[PDB]
Amino acid sequence: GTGYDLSNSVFSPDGRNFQVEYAVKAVENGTTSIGIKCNDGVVFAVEKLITSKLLVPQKNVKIQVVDRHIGCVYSGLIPDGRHLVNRGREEAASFKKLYKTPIPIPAFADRLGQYVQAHTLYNSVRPFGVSTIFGGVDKNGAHLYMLEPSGSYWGYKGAATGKGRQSAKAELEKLVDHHPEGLSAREAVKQAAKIIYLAHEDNKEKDFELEISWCSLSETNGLHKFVKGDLLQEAIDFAQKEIN
Amino acid sequence: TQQPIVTGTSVISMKYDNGVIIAADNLGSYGSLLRFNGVERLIPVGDNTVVGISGDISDMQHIERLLKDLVTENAYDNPLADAEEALEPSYIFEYLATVMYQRRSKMNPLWNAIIVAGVQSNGDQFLRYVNLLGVTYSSPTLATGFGAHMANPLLRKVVDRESDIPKTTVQVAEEAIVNAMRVLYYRDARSSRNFSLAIIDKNTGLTFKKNLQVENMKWDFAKDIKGYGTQK
């Protein structure tokens, strides 16, 4: 309403920053983005909508890499989403030089959430308008976070954001109940795809493109790499099979 | 103003018809004391280039992260880049040239003698020298340091000019590399028996052999020799 927005660092008598909550409103309007934790990896899946037949698909991603082992995928406004991964990239690089070991996955969550926080702290600069699901495999195993534009991060077994986030979490809800273990890496590829099919029944106007990436201990060798080919076809056949 | 502390000695290399051979002894020498042994000189950068470094081990490690970060950077800002806009020797070579020149002009250089050897995306052999000074030249045979003087004239028989690259095979080149290593073990006090040897090919890729030894070490003429020149 009126008062205590116009700025993002002015409290109200309810203790709540208005501008920042509208930051979360921006993330809803963006595309359906999900990430799945497994006990040996992590799998990232995305709905990159097809906005024309003049678009070139699977050549514009919302997947980005951090170091060579941390996957990232964003919801919200697309170039804001670029900018925050860029920050990630400078920290990855810097940490790796000084200590000569990769960025730990818990270490990463702390550091990102703090830049988000320096921009919610000053009245003068805007906050971020994107969420970032991220994680990978390191020496202390797989771990998965989702970072809110509010300044907050938590561990998750399955994290979802975007418009079709209501449907995707409902499917993820089955995934936790049914496997306490978070599911094997291989089946979670075909799973990651299924959820995005059922969640594009809320962005049904347009066409979509599924791109999948993963980081797995014994199958992507602790490093991040794209999922392609026969594996990709299978994730598609599986999703398809079960929407029908 | 820097003085080197622990230094590596010598890198030898030459062209062949299907790639390049880069090799050097494994050693960290603190002056008179041969302090550190098994100190890997050859850092592979991607899998289509090996970058060899002799000189200061301090600046060796420092470059080792910056090259690994050069690939990590290539992955950044693109959907693919490891075969799509694949990495080339040419990028490394100039990256290294700019940095060492800038640091030398700030009067606190990077103290190395560098051989970049790989095969391009075009497949054309790339073999070029870069150093603290900022010197750059491309030659059919290269060697750094002491090997520059000593072992290189042996490699210059095998290939004289640049139009004599296709007459050397992988077998011919390698046999000569071993011969150059034999010379260096003998008559350099800061060479070591141990050596690593990377063979870069365009139709096969990287085979990297570790911990080879010099064979056919001749010393049976030494028993016969007596005195300092005159034996009373």
Side-chain angles (χ1 to χ4, degrees):
Chain A
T2 312
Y4 308 126
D5 51 77
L6 286 176
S7 300
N8 49 90
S9 308
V10 172
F11 304 134
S12 63
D14 307 301
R16 292 193 74 186
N17 292 292
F18 291 123
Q19 190 174 328
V20 175
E21 291 188 55
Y22 308 144
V24 195
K25 188 64 53 188
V27 177
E28 197 177 311
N29 298 316
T31 66
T32 316
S33 302
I34 62 164
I36 273 166
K37 194 173 80 72
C38 297
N39 51 292
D40 71 281
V42 308
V43 182
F44 293 117
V46 79
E47 187 191 74
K48 181 67 181 180
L49 300 164
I50 289 175
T51 43
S52 58
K53 71 179 269 188
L54 290 174
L55 194 74
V56 190
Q58 308 173 105
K59 184 69 169 193
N60 306 288
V61 294
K62 282 184 162 214
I63 311 307
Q64 277 181 279
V65 72
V66 158
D67 205 63
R68 54 175 69 173
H69 73 293
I70 312 313
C72 289
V73 58
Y74 40 95
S75 179
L77 294 172
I78 323 181
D80 189 87
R82 196 155 287 108
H83 194 283
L84 190 55
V85 177
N86 278 327
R87 150 63 53 236
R89 287 163 170 185
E90 294 186 299
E91 309 183 314
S94 300
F95 192 99
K96 184 168 171 284
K97 190 163 167 165
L98 293 164
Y99 298 106
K100 189 175 160 66
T101 175
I103 24 172
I105 318 179
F108 201 47
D110 297 73
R111 294 156 79 86
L112 286 170
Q114 286 288 282
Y115 200 59
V116 170
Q117 161 65 14
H119 291 50
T120 47
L121 185 89
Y122 303 129
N123 284 271
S124 291
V125 295
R126 192 167 48 98
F128 286 86
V130 296
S131 292
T132 304
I133 325 190
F134 56 88
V137 164
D138 56 350
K139 54 199 175 303
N140 304 327
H143 288 84
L144 189 85
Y145 294 86
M146 164 175 87
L147 160 64
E148 299 189 56
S150 304
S152 313
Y153 46 91
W154 294 116
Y156 288 92
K157 290 209 178 83
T161 178
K163 190 65 215 203
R165 78 157 68 106
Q166 307 193 263
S167 312
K169 281 177 54 181
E171 300 294 293
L172 278 155
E173 184 78 75
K174 282 169 43 165
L175 179 73
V176 179
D177 202 285
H178 295 160
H179 306 95
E181 72 160 58
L183 186 65
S184 313
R186 194 63 176 95
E187 285 277 38
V189 166
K190 309 187 174 185
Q191 187 66 51
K194 182 173 59 187
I195 295 170
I196 292 286
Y197 264 82
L198 294 164
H200 183 62
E201 304 299 294
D202 312 281
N203 294 291
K204 200 53 181 178
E205 206 197 63
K206 304 167 260 283
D207 293 75
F208 79 106
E209 183 54 54
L210 182 59
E211 168 65 63
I212 300 168
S213 53
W214 65 337
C215 179
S216 290
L217 190 55
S218 299
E219 290 181 76
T220 328
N221 307 2
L223 296 184
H224 193 257
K225 209 58 174 63
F226 296 86
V227 187
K228 294 280 182 59
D230 298 293
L231 298 65
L232 182 78
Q233 291 325 124
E234 292 198 330
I236 283 167
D237 299 338
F238 191 105
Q240 187 53 263
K241 183 169 166 47
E242 302 288 55
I243 179 180
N244 269 13
Chain B
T1 279
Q2 298 167 0
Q3 175 84 98
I5 290 289
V6 273
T7 39
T9 303
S10 306
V11 189
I12 49 183
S13 53
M14 70 182 294
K15 302 187 177 176
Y16 73 95
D17 71 321
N18 290 323
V20 294
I21 290 177
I22 187 173
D25 57 281
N26 306 311
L27 199 61
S29 301
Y30 186 32
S32 54
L33 183 48
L34 307 178
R35 189 156 181 198
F36 294 153
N37 296 90
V39 180
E40 212 66 320
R41 296 284 191 80
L42 293 186
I43 311 298
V45 187
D47 64 264
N48 284 16
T49 319
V50 180
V51 167
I53 309 172
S54 35
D56 207 352
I57 312 296
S58 286
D59 304 296
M60 201 175 73
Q61 306 310 111
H62 195 73
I63 289 160
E64 184 183 47
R65 294 178 305 219
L66 313 163
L67 290 176
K68 288 284 161 57
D69 281 355
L70 189 64
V71 188
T72 294
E73 201 272 286
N74 192 34
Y76 293 173
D77 296 289
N78 288 87
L80 192 59
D82 291 280
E84 165 165 291
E85 298 181 66
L87 201 90
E88 290 207 343
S90 319
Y91 308 147
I92 303 170
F93 180 61
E94 287 283 308
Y95 181 74
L96 290 172
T98 299
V99 148
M100 298 168 92
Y101 187 68
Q102 196 69 245
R103 285 257 291 147
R104 165 254 175 192
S105 306
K106 299 198 290 173
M107 295 299 288
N108 296 95
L110 285 176
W111 201 284
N112 312 99
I114 307 190
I115 308 184
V116 184
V119 287
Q120 300 193 84
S121 290
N122 304 289
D124 182 50
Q125 305 71 37
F126 197 91
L127 183 50
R128 299 210 59 171
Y129 166 101
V130 67
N131 68 326
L132 78 178
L133 290 164
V135 200
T136 66
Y137 54 93
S138 166
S139 287
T141 67
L142 238 155
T144 58
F146 191 73
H149 292 69
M150 170 73 42
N152 207 71
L154 180 66
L155 298 191
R156 280 289 183 182
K157 306 180 177 311
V158 188
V159 174
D160 283 83
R161 58 176 78 262
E162 290 198 329
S163 284
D164 304 5
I165 296 176
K167 308 185 198 170
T168 298
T169 49
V170 60
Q171 310 186 18
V172 168
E174 200 192 328
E175 180 72 30
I177 287 276
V178 176
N179 289 148
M181 263 310 322
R182 232 164 59 88
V183 157
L184 283 165
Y185 180 61
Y186 306 146
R187 221 88 185 185
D188 182 50
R190 305 307 162 199
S191 203
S192 57
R193 185 184 175 184
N194 302 108
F195 61 91
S196 279
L197 181 145
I199 308 163
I200 311 97
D201 195 65
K202 78 197 184 194
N203 297 102
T204 309
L206 179 48
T207 301
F208 200 102
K209 292 198 291 197
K210 296 180 68 65
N211 301 102
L212 297 321
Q213 293 304 76
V214 180
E215 311 293 284
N216 306 296
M217 300 210 292
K218 291 173 44 63
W219 304 99
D220 332 275
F221 63 108
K223 69 164 177 305
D224 309 280
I225 298 175
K226 301 186 264 299
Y228 63 102
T230 308
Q231 169 75 66
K232 271 295 190 292

